[PDB]
């Protein structure tokens, strides 16, 4: 009727997590680096750990189930998998530590050093990890730069699968109800009639895409969330960022058009960015570009900088980290 998804969860005992320090809190939980050593492996594997206050809510250990759903079913170099998960007196999901994380924040802190090179490369990027979503029938509900994680400066990888959503055999629109919704980064149709598909996450790629280029900015800042539809409705959309020219820009405007048909699809937005991405400083005007660098793995203290000598013998990055 549908493919089985055979994908393995990985039970994983506390016992082989080490160093743990906290990265990060919220009402939902907690998340932790650590790291992950298989028993008799001489591997030492630099994680995160999620997990929330306590197991005791019924619909958490519910969604954070099947967030670990979700996460166990992907494969790609630019989305996040789970490595397991962990069962204590709480849930905790286990993931590949992404050690410069969210990207949001990255752009926030690191504009002086963002090049052209690099906003168009994460474009490309962002876009195949969002083709292969689609190719495995999920839908994200959730695409922000928030929801983006950086491996390195060069490599960036979509997370928090918390609110997708698979479509069946020969189904189309994902028709939710109720709960807490990122109405700055949704579709018109997905605000108004809770509908989403593939193209409504074209819409949020679009709105990523304006905080990337904007260097972090909040889109409709000070406007009231229930204001949104509104404006939307009236034809409003967000600005041209200083940096883009007309070429990047109408690409972002594309994802906003009210026909979920007319937007593009992931594989056309991965094509026209990485058009751009071989003459950067044609498509996007930053002052100074020219003359700007990010760490690469290939640094001294790259290594160093996030890792114990003690350890650094035998850490393997989950990406070189394969089980049968
Ligand atoms: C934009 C703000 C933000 O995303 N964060 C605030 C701190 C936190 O930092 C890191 C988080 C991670 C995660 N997160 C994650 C998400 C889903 C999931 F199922 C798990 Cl197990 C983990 N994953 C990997 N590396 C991280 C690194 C962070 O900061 C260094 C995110």
């Given at each position: ?231 939307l409705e009236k034809g409003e959309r967000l600005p041209q960022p200083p940096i883009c020219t007309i070429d990047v820009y109408m690409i972002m405007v594309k ?47 790259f290594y160093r900088a996030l890792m114990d000598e003690e350890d650094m013998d035998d850490v393997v990055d989950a990406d070189e980290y394969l089980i049968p």
């Open positions: 009727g549908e493919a089985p998804n055979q994908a393995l969860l990985r039970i994983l005992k506390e016992t082989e997590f080490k160093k743990i320090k906290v990265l990060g809190s919220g009402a939902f939980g907690t998340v932790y680096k650590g790291l992950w050593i298989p028993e008799g492996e001489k591997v030492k594997i630099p994680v995160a750990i999620k997990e929330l206050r306590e197991a005791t809510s019924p619909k958490a250990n519910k969604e954070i189930l099947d967030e670990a759903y979700v996460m166990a079913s992907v494969d790609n170099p630019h989305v996040c998998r789970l490595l397991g998960i962990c069962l204590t007196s709480t849930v905790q999901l286990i993931t590949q530590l992404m050690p410069f994380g969210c990207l949001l924040d990255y752009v926030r802190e690191h504009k002086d050093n963002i090049g052209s090179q690099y906003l168009l490369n994460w474009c490309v990027q962002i876009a195949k990890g969002m083709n292969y979503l689609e190719d495995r029938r999920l839908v994200h509900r959730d695409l922000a730069a928030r929801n983006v994680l950086v491996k390195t400066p060069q490599h960036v990888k979509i997370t928090d699968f918390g609110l997708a959503k698979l479509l069946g055999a020969e189904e189309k629109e994902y028709h939710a109800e109720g709960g807490k919704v990122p109405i700055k980064w949704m579709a018109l149709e997905s605000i108004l009639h809770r509908i989403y598909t593939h193209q409504s996450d074209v819409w949020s790629y679009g709105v990523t895409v304006w905080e990337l280029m904007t260097f972090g900015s909040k889109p409709y800042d000070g406007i009231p969330a229930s204001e949104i539809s509104s404006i994802c906003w058009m009210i026909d979920a048909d007319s937007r593009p699809k992931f594989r056309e937005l991965i094509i026209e960015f990485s058009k751009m991405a071989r003459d950067p400083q044609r498509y996007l005007v930053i002052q100074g570009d020219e003359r700007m660098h990010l760490p690469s793995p290939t640094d001294s203290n």
